Design an enzyme around this catalytic site. Sequence first.
Site, PDB file in Angstrom:
ATOM      1  N   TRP A   1       6.888  21.229  55.403  1.00 12.85           N
ATOM      2  CA  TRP A   1       6.306  21.062  54.067  1.00 12.85           C
ATOM      3  C   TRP A   1       5.798  22.414  53.589  1.00 12.85           C
ATOM      4  O   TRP A   1       5.487  23.291  54.394  1.00 12.85           O
ATOM      5  CB  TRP A   1       5.181  20.014  54.050  1.00 12.85           C
ATOM      6  CG  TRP A   1       4.144  20.230  55.080  1.00 12.85           C
ATOM      7  CD1 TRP A   1       3.152  21.174  55.065  1.00 12.85           C
ATOM      8  CD2 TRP A   1       3.981  19.490  56.290  1.00 12.85           C
ATOM      9  NE1 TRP A   1       2.390  21.067  56.203  1.00 12.85           N
ATOM     10  CE2 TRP A   1       2.874  20.036  56.969  1.00 12.85           C
ATOM     11  CE3 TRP A   1       4.661  18.409  56.864  1.00 12.85           C
ATOM     12  CZ2 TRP A   1       2.428  19.539  58.194  1.00 12.85           C
ATOM     13  CZ3 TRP A   1       4.224  17.918  58.081  1.00 12.85           C
ATOM     14  CH2 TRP A   1       3.113  18.484  58.734  1.00 12.85           C
TER      15      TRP A   1
ATOM     16  N   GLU B   1       4.547  29.978  49.025  1.00  4.86           N
ATOM     17  CA  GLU B   1       6.004  30.143  49.084  1.00  4.86           C
ATOM     18  C   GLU B   1       6.602  29.927  47.691  1.00  4.86           C
ATOM     19  O   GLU B   1       7.516  30.643  47.260  1.00  4.86           O
ATOM     20  CB  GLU B   1       6.653  29.163  50.075  1.00  4.86           C
ATOM     21  CG  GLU B   1       6.385  29.435  51.576  1.00  4.86           C
ATOM     22  CD  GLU B   1       6.935  28.320  52.492  1.00  4.86           C
ATOM     23  OE1 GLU B   1       8.114  28.399  52.916  1.00  4.86           O
ATOM     24  OE2 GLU B   1       6.196  27.350  52.795  1.00  4.86           O
TER      25      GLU B   1
ATOM     26  N   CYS C   1       6.654  31.763  61.728  1.00  2.00           N
ATOM     27  CA  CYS C   1       6.304  30.488  61.098  1.00  2.00           C
ATOM     28  C   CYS C   1       4.813  30.210  61.231  1.00  2.00           C
ATOM     29  O   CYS C   1       4.292  30.090  62.343  1.00  2.00           O
ATOM     30  CB  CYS C   1       7.088  29.333  61.728  1.00  2.00           C
ATOM     31  SG  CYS C   1       6.594  27.709  61.069  1.00  2.00           S
TER      32      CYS C   1
ATOM     33  N   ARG D   1       3.129  26.370  62.959  1.00  2.00           N
ATOM     34  CA  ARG D   1       3.505  25.907  64.285  1.00  2.00           C
ATOM     35  C   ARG D   1       2.462  25.044  64.989  1.00  2.00           C
ATOM     36  O   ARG D   1       2.698  24.581  66.097  1.00  2.00           O
ATOM     37  CB  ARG D   1       3.888  27.089  65.171  1.00  2.00           C
ATOM     38  CG  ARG D   1       5.164  27.785  64.747  1.00  2.00           C
ATOM     39  CD  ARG D   1       5.438  28.952  65.657  1.00  2.00           C
ATOM     40  NE  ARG D   1       4.718  30.155  65.250  1.00  2.00           N
ATOM     41  CZ  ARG D   1       4.516  31.197  66.046  1.00  2.00           C
ATOM     42  NH1 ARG D   1       4.987  31.161  67.285  1.00  2.00           N
ATOM     43  NH2 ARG D   1       3.858  32.273  65.613  1.00  2.00           N
TER      44      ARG D   1
HETATM   45  C1  HEM Z   1       5.511  21.518  58.906  1.00  2.00           C
HETATM   46  C2  HEM Z   1       4.899  22.511  58.243  1.00  2.00           C
HETATM   47  C3  HEM Z   1       5.456  23.952  58.186  1.00  2.00           C
HETATM   48  C4  HEM Z   1       4.845  24.958  57.552  1.00  2.00           C
HETATM   49  C5  HEM Z   1       3.515  24.853  56.779  1.00  2.00           C
HETATM   50  C6  HEM Z   1       5.657  26.150  57.703  1.00  2.00           C
HETATM   51  C7  HEM Z   1       5.386  27.396  57.192  1.00  2.00           C
HETATM   52  C8  HEM Z   1       6.257  28.461  57.152  1.00  2.00           C
HETATM   53  C9  HEM Z   1       6.187  29.621  56.270  1.00  2.00           C
HETATM   54  C10 HEM Z   1       5.126  29.876  55.175  1.00  2.00           C
HETATM   55  C11 HEM Z   1       7.204  30.436  56.563  1.00  2.00           C
HETATM   56  C12 HEM Z   1       7.562  31.775  55.858  1.00  2.00           C
HETATM   57  C13 HEM Z   1       8.930  31.560  55.173  1.00  2.00           C
HETATM   58  C14 HEM Z   1       9.270  32.689  54.232  1.00  2.00           C
HETATM   59  O1  HEM Z   1       8.332  33.389  53.762  1.00  2.00           O
HETATM   60  O2  HEM Z   1      10.483  32.882  53.942  1.00  2.00           O
HETATM   61  C15 HEM Z   1       7.951  29.816  57.632  1.00  2.00           C
HETATM   62  C16 HEM Z   1       9.076  30.316  58.230  1.00  2.00           C
HETATM   63  C17 HEM Z   1       9.724  29.755  59.311  1.00  2.00           C
HETATM   64  N1  HEM Z   1       9.527  28.491  59.849  1.00  2.00           N
HETATM   65 FE1  HEM Z   1       8.094  27.162  59.233  1.00  2.00          FE
HETATM   66  N2  HEM Z   1       6.762  25.821  58.460  1.00  2.00           N
HETATM   67  C18 HEM Z   1       6.686  24.477  58.777  1.00  2.00           C
HETATM   68  C19 HEM Z   1       7.650  23.799  59.510  1.00  2.00           C
HETATM   69  C20 HEM Z   1       8.626  24.376  60.297  1.00  2.00           C
HETATM   70  C21 HEM Z   1       9.548  23.680  61.173  1.00  2.00           C
HETATM   71  C22 HEM Z   1       9.583  22.142  61.296  1.00  2.00           C
HETATM   72  C23 HEM Z   1      10.325  24.602  61.777  1.00  2.00           C
HETATM   73  C24 HEM Z   1      11.468  24.419  62.811  1.00  2.00           C
HETATM   74  C25 HEM Z   1      11.648  23.282  63.503  1.00  2.00           C
HETATM   75  C26 HEM Z   1       9.895  25.899  61.310  1.00  2.00           C
HETATM   76  C27 HEM Z   1      10.415  27.116  61.689  1.00  2.00           C
HETATM   77  C28 HEM Z   1      10.355  28.266  60.937  1.00  2.00           C
HETATM   78  C29 HEM Z   1      11.166  29.435  61.148  1.00  2.00           C
HETATM   79  C30 HEM Z   1      12.232  29.676  62.239  1.00  2.00           C
HETATM   80  C31 HEM Z   1      10.737  30.418  60.072  1.00  2.00           C
HETATM   81  C32 HEM Z   1      11.290  31.826  59.830  1.00  2.00           C
HETATM   82  C33 HEM Z   1      12.422  31.610  58.835  1.00  2.00           C
HETATM   83  C34 HEM Z   1      13.003  32.949  58.483  1.00  2.00           C
HETATM   84  O3  HEM Z   1      12.818  33.886  59.308  1.00  2.00           O
HETATM   85  O4  HEM Z   1      13.634  33.062  57.400  1.00  2.00           O
HETATM   86  N3  HEM Z   1       8.873  25.726  60.403  1.00  2.00           N
HETATM   87  N4  HEM Z   1       7.345  28.613  57.974  1.00  2.00           N
HETATM   88  C1  LIG Z   2      16.017  37.549  55.621  1.00  6.02           C
HETATM   89  C2  LIG Z   2      16.472  38.526  54.739  1.00  6.02           C
HETATM   90  N1  LIG Z   2      16.430  38.336  53.410  1.00  6.02           N
HETATM   91  C3  LIG Z   2      15.945  37.201  52.887  1.00  6.02           C
HETATM   92  C4  LIG Z   2      15.479  36.187  53.724  1.00  6.02           C
HETATM   93  C5  LIG Z   2      14.932  34.909  53.135  1.00  6.02           C
HETATM   94  C6  LIG Z   2      14.117  34.201  54.203  1.00  6.02           C
HETATM   95  C7  LIG Z   2      13.938  32.724  53.885  1.00  6.02           C
HETATM   96  N2  LIG Z   2      13.082  32.156  54.937  1.00  6.02           N
HETATM   97  C8  LIG Z   2      13.000  30.708  54.739  1.00  6.02           C
HETATM   98  C9  LIG Z   2      12.190  30.394  53.484  1.00  6.02           C
HETATM   99  C10 LIG Z   2      12.006  28.914  53.578  1.00  6.02           C
HETATM  100  C11 LIG Z   2      12.522  28.071  52.604  1.00  6.02           C
HETATM  101  C12 LIG Z   2      12.366  26.707  52.740  1.00  6.02           C
HETATM  102  N3  LIG Z   2      11.736  26.225  53.813  1.00  6.02           N
HETATM  103  C13 LIG Z   2      11.254  27.068  54.756  1.00  6.02           C
HETATM  104  N4  LIG Z   2      10.618  26.554  55.807  1.00  6.02           N
HETATM  105  C14 LIG Z   2      10.582  25.242  56.020  1.00  6.02           C
HETATM  106  C15 LIG Z   2       9.830  25.148  57.170  1.00  6.02           C
HETATM  107  N5  LIG Z   2       9.476  26.402  57.540  1.00  6.02           N
HETATM  108  C16 LIG Z   2       9.954  27.311  56.677  1.00  6.02           C
HETATM  109  N6  LIG Z   2      11.386  28.409  54.649  1.00  6.02           N
HETATM  110  C17 LIG Z   2      15.513  36.360  55.106  1.00  6.02           C
END
Ligand code: HEM
Ligand SMILES: c1cncc(CCCNCCc2ccnc(-n3ccnc3)n2)c1
Lengths: 411, 407
Positions: B278, B283, B106, B109
């Site tokens: 947000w 994305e 993420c 963070r």
């Molecule tokens: C508030 C502004 C935030 C931004 C700008 C942000 C940004 C991002 C981005 C760009 C990704 C890549 C997702 C993808 O390519 O599929 C991501 C993934 C992720 N984010 Fe965030 N995020 C935010 C908030 C959060 C919050 C609030 C949480 C949890 C409480 C979080 C936890 C995660 C996790 C666990 C992933 C990995 C998801 C996956 O592996 O599919 N993020 N985030």
């Molecule tokens: C593993 C294998 N094949 C496909 C995937 C899709 C990953 C999607 N990751 C989350 C993308 C997403 C969508 C909306 N919000 C956020 N999000 C919000 C805050 N941080 C991330 N992430 C994971």
Amino acid sequence: RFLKVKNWETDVVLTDTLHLKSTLETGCTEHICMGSIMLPVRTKDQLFPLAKEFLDQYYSSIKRFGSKAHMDRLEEVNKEIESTSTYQLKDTELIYGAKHAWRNASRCVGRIQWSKLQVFDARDCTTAHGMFNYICNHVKYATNKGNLRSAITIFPQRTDGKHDFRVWNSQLIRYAGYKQPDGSTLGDPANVQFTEICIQQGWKAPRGRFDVLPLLLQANGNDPELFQIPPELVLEVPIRHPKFDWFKDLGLKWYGLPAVSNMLLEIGGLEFSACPFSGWYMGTEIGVRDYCDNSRYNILEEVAKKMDLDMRKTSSLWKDQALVEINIAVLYSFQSDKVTIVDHHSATESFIKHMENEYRCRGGCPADWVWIVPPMSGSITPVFHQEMLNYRLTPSFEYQPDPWNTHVWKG
Amino acid sequence: RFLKVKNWETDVVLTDTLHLKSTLETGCTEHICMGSIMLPTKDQLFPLAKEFLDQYYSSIKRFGSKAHMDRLEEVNKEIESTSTYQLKDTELIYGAKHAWRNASRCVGRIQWSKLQVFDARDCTTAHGMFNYICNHVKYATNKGNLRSAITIFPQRTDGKHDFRVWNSQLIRYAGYKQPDGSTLGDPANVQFTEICIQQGWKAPRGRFDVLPLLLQANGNDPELFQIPPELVLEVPIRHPKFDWFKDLGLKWYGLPAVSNMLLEIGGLEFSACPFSGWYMGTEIGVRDYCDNSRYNILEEVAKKMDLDMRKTSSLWKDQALVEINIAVLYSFQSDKVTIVDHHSATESFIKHMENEYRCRGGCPADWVWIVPPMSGSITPVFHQEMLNYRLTPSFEYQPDPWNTHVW
Ligand code: HEM
Ligand SMILES: c1cncc(CCCNCCc2ccnc(-n3ccnc3)n2)c1
Ligand code: HEM
Ligand SMILES: c1cncc(CCCNCCc2ccnc(-n3ccnc3)n2)c1
Ligand SMILES: C[C@H](O)[C@H](O)[C@H]1CNc2nc(N)[nH]c(=O)c2N1
Ligand SMILES: C[C@H](O)[C@H](O)[C@H]1CNc2nc(N)[nH]c(=O)c2N1
Ligand SMILES: [Zn+2]
């Protein structure tokens, strides 16, 4: 053990068995991944197993595994090792070796071409002047008037580690970098330390923005010597844009031949510390990294001003916009001057096919995702969506310390 | 054992000590790196609880206090008694904020400590779940001034009574396979759109239809609910240059809300824990719009810009890609919906890394995911070495519910 990798754009799954033959270590463990880390004298004791493993591979590839020719050779090398503490590769083994080191280079996106490699055997070379001559012939051969051909020149292997042959330049052709008193930098900032060494070693620097560096060549462990590559052998391309006619006025040019000269080639436990190689450029190496890295020529601002882009907020994506035009300029200029170059779409699509082929015919293809994915437009090239396994096969190209940090100066 | 990370643009070196706490495994070995792979009892439970409580109490500067020891005892007693235990609200909030803090994939963070945690552990039904989610959506959306939030449903008991949100995101567009062979809407959701119909949904077979929620409570069969439209903030996509852009018919939603992950705190497992932040512009603009297996609009936009699509060498895909992403950011900004661009977000992550190294001794990061899908090397994170490792509390992937559900 089998390992599967998935392409998430096509659902194509491939199975890797090749990784089992990996001896060397990755840097990673079960608890930490070091996949984004840039950088994570040998006894007769360990040498023959290394020789044998290599010779086994070689003889397998020529479908003569277990032959009398194979057994005689193992016998011959063994004897030469205990008698002399090292051994000499045959020409055939040297060529196979070099091709396979390329083939195994997990950071190289150009490997579809691996089997077409011109190998120049410079193992009879004894002096720096000797080295200069070999390198000139390489540049001229590889350049081929703009129709680039892949080549490698191989100088004698390491003996005791005190008689090393080394090309001190990181690339055969590179531009000088000069730190100014005002703290600014003229030319290529990546080459500042090396340019300083050259000047100190007696080089008369023109002190311009695109000065081709001299070769600093070390033979047989002696102090390195300077040579100027004949200008007529250095193909360059002035950079212009197909639609923006002010682009030419930026005064940009680049060289046509990308040639790595600071790596070490390992074959059968032998170490070749001077092994310059060359292919042709993927356009982004120049247009993205060479021109636009903050720590290189960094032309993004100047190009952005001239484009009249909104540079007040990053969210205008002015940087991204300029970056594209610059990379268009590079590809345009090279194609116009009929100098081989490949765009990052063509190159990555070819690598996927190469890769798929390598899984079928070979059981795998080690690849470093962090380096295979181009430094712009990543996810609109197919490699971004391709899972990859990284592991180390021999023969291989390895990093080695810069010789100015290790060299014992004779004076 | 004391690892160093170098930034190659600034020469800055940080030292990582925090990795020496990692417990879970990476998928990598010393022989082979899997850094680019997407998915690499009472006796089990108490050490897990202990490790957690130890760090919680360490974080509040009462390590080895009576309160600490007492709590440790109390939890030990409860596990011995009930086979599980329950978190104090304070622990829950801490656990969730730290799950985020530890999310190596993420980029956002730097915000980790400003997370609104909604305790929904008292929830019992799918209707109850629906209520909690609408409340989460409304709170987090906040008329366009987005605020991060997580809503946490009851923890796993015996795996027969799992709470699950079946959607992968609270808000996604539908995907329908046509007789044409082509795909209408979002291809990533084609299958989910199906199970909506098979369970009852009345699909308006459009291109941008907000999917319904499919909520499963207490291991029961899942139910459908339509999010109130007025709670789903959407943004019509226009370009600040090309008047024709609007005619593509493109919109995206404002709230990015991941609903399919598993939150692990002190050995306890929360299978329903939707969270939202947000968007980073890429994305939507790069991935959602331009991936081949997604909305795949590059060809259309290129034709509209009248670029020479004959050769890859004109970089027409690259040119279009930038404009699209300019549009995305433009549109969100115009309607005052929070969005961040890849430059600002990565710049901020570098800062957060420097803080995390300085105040915690490290920051686990997955370079493959942190570097944006466009313009990679002109963002600072490209030149930043990162160490990836798994700390807990964590967000984990988990199987899609339809492949596990005992109907
Ligand atoms: C508030 C502004 C935030 C931004 C700008 C942000 C940004 C991002 C981005 C760009 C990704 C890549 C997702 C993808 O390519 O599929 C991501 C993934 C992720 N984010 Fe965030 N995020 C935010 C908030 C959060 C919050 C609030 C949480 C949890 C409480 C979080 C936890 C995660 C996790 C666990 C992933 C990995 C998801 C996956 O592996 O599919 N993020 N985030
Ligand atoms: C593993 C294998 N094949 C496909 C995937 C899709 C990953 C999607 N990751 C989350 C993308 C997403 C969508 C909306 N919000 C956020 N999000 C919000 C805050 N941080 C991330 N992430 C994971
Ligand atoms: C023929 C066209 C070729 C193309 C288009 C190509 C492409 C590339 C690119 C883009 C890189 C990344 C460079 C960087 O970012 O630092 C690279 C690295 C590399 N290439 Fe090639 N290559 C070609 C030929 C060759 C040849 C002939 C060899 C050796 C015989 C080779 C071996 C390597 C190795 C060992 C690396 C890693 C260098 C390092 O780690 O610094 N390549 N290649
Ligand atoms: C560490 C930190 N910061 C920067 C670097 C530069 C690594 C150099 N990689 C080789 C680049 C290059 C140049 C010219 N040709 C080729 N080349 C030729 C064939 N294949 C690659 N590669 C290392
Ligand atoms: C830290 C990171 O590994 C480093 O910046 C890498 C990223 N990927 C790269 N990829 C290529 N092709 N060349 C590089 O120099 C780098 N640099
Ligand atoms: C195969 C590869 O791991 C896959 O395409 C990854 C690459 N990096 C990514 N990075 C982010 N942020 N999101 C993703 O979905 C992916 N996909
Ligand atoms: Zn790894």
